[PDB]
Amino acid sequence: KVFGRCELAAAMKRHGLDNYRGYSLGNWVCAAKFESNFNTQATNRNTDGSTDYGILQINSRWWCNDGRTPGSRNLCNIPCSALLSSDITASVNCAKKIVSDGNGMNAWVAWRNRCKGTDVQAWIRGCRL
């Protein structure tokens, strides 16, 4: 399921990401654009048994359990496949777990390098909100 920016903004705001730990809603929408291009089914295997999953690309060695990654920590205590749904709830709940503080969006490399310092607000301007 590929999302629209506004549809995704709306849904993320519905789940408490607006100003979560100080981060404005646009950060989240920007992170998703660069991580999975708004695709819930997105997946990405890395040069280590790990695979990033879903709209926010959650790692299988640390946060979810894909069953095929050596040293899975499963911190969100979730199977990586639940993160692959069209309803973002589980992906959101794990991400809120990952961002334990005001500098935690750094957990996403695309955000830190492609979003931080830019007008992320631009992604939600004109959206019903």
């Epitope: 100080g22 404005s24 931080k116 310092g117 830019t118 007008d119 607000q121 301007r125 909100l129």
Partner: antibody
Framework: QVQLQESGPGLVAPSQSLSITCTVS????????VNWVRQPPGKGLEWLGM???????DYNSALKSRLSISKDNSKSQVFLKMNSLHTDDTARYYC??????????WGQGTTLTVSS | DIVLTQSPASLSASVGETVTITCRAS??????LAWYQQKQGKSPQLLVY???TLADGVPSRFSGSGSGTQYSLKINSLQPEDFGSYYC?????????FGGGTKLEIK
């Protein structure tokens, strides 16, 4: 330790083009924006414009045509250039870091007076 | 531009009083509003951002509220160090603007 410090000429005549510097430390210029704000003697704060982390700039609509903001990421400096100085430009000039839609750190400010 | 109308201009109050400063936006700024305090000859200091979030180190006696186009800063039991000037600023698109300010002086 995030700090922004301004440095300007102090007294200029309308016969000049103003250049103010803002040297920052404790953070990268590509990761944050820098706003420029002034405060005329005994008046309120006026927003002049900004430069985003990515180099893009935005300006106060009235002052747009006589302002120019640039930066040198490597020297950790942001510059405010202003032309056609009016005596109304006399003010204290500030540079402040923008971090996710709030100016969280401000330099001390530098006082500028426009003469004849 | 979205202009901000801040009121009142001055406020005389005593230590222990609770006061309210308001900023009305000429258009919806969607909660992208911050408040600053500026003391005698000092640079502005952020207090609240995103309408209701306190900056670090900022005491709980300060609280912000508002939505759409009416915004407020409430100070509960003013302390001697709260006297100074206060300003609101919007962060909805560009250009950004400030409110005219409020001088909070001792009664």
């Amino acid at each position: 330790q995030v700090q922004l410090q301004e440095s300007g000429p102090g007294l200029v005549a309308p016969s000049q083009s103003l250049s103010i510097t803002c040297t920052v430390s404790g953070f990268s210029l590509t990761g944050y924006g820098v706003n420029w704000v002034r405060q005329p003697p005994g008046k309120g704060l006026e927003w002049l414009g900004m430069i985003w982390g990515d180099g893009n700039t935005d300006y106060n609509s009235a002052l747009k045509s006589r302002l120019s903001i640039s930066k040198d990421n490597s020297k950790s400096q942001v510059f405010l250039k202003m032309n056609s100085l009016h005596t109304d430009d006399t003010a204290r000039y500030y540079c402040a870091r923008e971090r996710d839609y709030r100016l969280d750190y401000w330099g001390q400010g530098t006082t500028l007076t426009v003469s004849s | 531009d979205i202009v901000l109308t801040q009121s009142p201009a001055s406020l005389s109050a005593s230590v222990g009083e609770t006061v309210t400063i308001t900023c009305r936006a000429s258009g919806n700024i969607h909660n992208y509003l911050a408040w600053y305090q500026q003391k005698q000859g000092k640079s502005p200091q952020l207090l609240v951002y995103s309408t209701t979030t306190l900056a670090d180190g900022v005491p709980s006696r300060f609280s912000g509220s508002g939505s759409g186009t009416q915004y407020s800063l409430k100070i509960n039991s003013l302390q001697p160090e709260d006297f100074g000037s206060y300003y609101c600023q919007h962060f909805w698109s560009t250009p950004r603007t400030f409110g005219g300010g409020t001088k909070l002086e001792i009664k």
